[PDB]
Design an enzyme around this catalytic site. Structure first.
Site, PDB file in Angstrom:
ATOM      1  N   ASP A  14       0.706  -1.033   0.063  1.00 19.23           N
ATOM      2  CA  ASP A  14      -0.106  -0.079   0.063  1.00 19.23           C
ATOM      3  C   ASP A  14       0.781   1.320  -0.123  1.00 19.23           C
ATOM      4  O   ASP A  14       1.476   1.669   0.858  1.00 19.23           O
ATOM      5  CB  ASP A  14      -1.013   0.112   1.226  1.00 19.23           C
ATOM      6  N   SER A  41      -0.547  16.062 -11.292  1.00 17.57           N
ATOM      7  CA  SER A  41      -1.139  15.636 -12.910  1.00 17.57           C
ATOM      8  C   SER A  41      -1.172  17.070 -13.735  1.00 17.57           C
ATOM      9  O   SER A  41      -1.799  18.026 -13.292  1.00 17.57           O
ATOM     10  CB  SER A  41      -2.128  14.784 -13.073  1.00 17.57           C
TER      11      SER A  41
HETATM   12 XE    XE Z   1      -6.112  13.881 -13.893  1.00 12.52          XE
END
Ligand code: XE
Length: 330
Positions: free
Chosen positions: A35, A199
């Site tokens: 994780d 992003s």
């Molecule tokens: Xe994204």
């Protein structure tokens, strides 16, 4: 040193992935959920409340000649999904795909929440976020990667999750046969303890790329892709009949639909999630309403690049002094 281990989806939907881990002497092999969104290595054990164990493999420290109780140490954790666990701590030898760490903190569960009990396939978690999040009290403990880092050929690990198929977790090296093109690296903030990055934007299906900064975390322990409501509504608007359902808990769509792809940006590079990766099947057995794999992060407080996104890429977790994240198509 290096390690290399195969990771396997737990069910036909890739709800999670399990990786075999050797603990103690002689080895006890447990299948753990790696994780990158948490920082505790915890296991079902001989100390776990007997009614809360249902088919899992347990760690028995008393059968390990290298186990040592970590005096006075306890742990207790709560996940984004609402699940939790708690217990006591041993140190012991832990090996992953041929990579061995001595003196690793192995958190033994005395209690687990019902979701863990009900999933017979996961014997515990192996956390790979930053050690600042580790819950052990009153002395915080280091994650497997942190303990192994100095020994590794290179201070990195990579996640190569498969779609409906096994994948690989590598430690200490980058397998240049496992991706196409080049790896694009992007900056990481460790301030919240996660592999947090930004992003550069997205596209829906064949649509135009929208350049916009979307901060989120790379989280192998989360199944789905959780993104801002605007982005998610733009995605599902391209699927006829798709709707957000409050009763279900998210976007659902007709099981007869063909889903469009979803592209996300990494710097100037682009990772394409094929539409099929976004189908999580009937909301209930026999239903013709299917659960979507891209969901809104609006209730959560953070965007999460979970398995749905990560499995479309070869992902490098670079644990250099200044950490970074790398993404390649594959
Ligand atoms: Xe994204």
């Amino acid at each position: 040193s290096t390690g290399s281990a195969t990771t396997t989806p737990i069910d036909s939907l890739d709800d999670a992935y399990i990786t075999p881990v050797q603990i103690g002497t002689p080895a006890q092999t447990l299948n753990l959920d790696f994780d990158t969104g948490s920082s505790d290595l915890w296991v079902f054990s001989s100390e776990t409340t007997a009614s809360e164990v249902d088919g899992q493999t347990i760690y028995t420290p008393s059968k390990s000649t290298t186990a040592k109780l970590l005096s006075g140490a306890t742990w207790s954790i709560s996940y984004g999904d609402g699940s939790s666990s708690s217990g006591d701590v041993y140190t012991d030898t832990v090996s992953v795909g041929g990579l061995t760490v001595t003196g690793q903190a192995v958190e033994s569960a005395k209690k687990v929440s019902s979701s863990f009990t009900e999933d017979s396939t996961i014997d515990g978690l192996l956390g790979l976020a930053f050690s600042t999040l580790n819950t052990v009290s009153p002395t915080q403990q280091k994650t497997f990667f942190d303990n192994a880092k100095a020994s590794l050929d290179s201070p990195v690990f990579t996640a190569d999750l498969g779609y409906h198929a096994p994948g690989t977790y590598n430690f200490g090296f980058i397998d240049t046969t496992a991706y196409t093109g080049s790896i694009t690296y992007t900056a990481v903030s460790t301030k919240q303890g996660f592999w947090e990055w930004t992003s550069t934007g997205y596209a829906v299906g064949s649509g135009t790329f929208k350049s916009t900064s979307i901060d989120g975390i790379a989280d192998t322990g989360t199944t789905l892709l959780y993104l801002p409501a605007t982005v998610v509504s733009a995605y599902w608007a391209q699927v006829s009949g798709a709707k957000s359902s409050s009763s279900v808990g998210g976007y659902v769509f007709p099981c007869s639909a063909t889903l469009p792809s979803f592209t996300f940006g990494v710097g100037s590079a682009r990772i394409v999630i094929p539409g099929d990766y976004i189908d999580f099947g009937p909301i209930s057995t026999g239903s013709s309403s299917c659960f979507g794999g891209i969901q809104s992060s609006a209730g959560i407080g953070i965007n999460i690049f979970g398995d749905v996104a990560l499995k479309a890429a070869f992902v490098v977790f670079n644990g250099a002094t200044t950490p970074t994240l790398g993404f390649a198509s594959k």
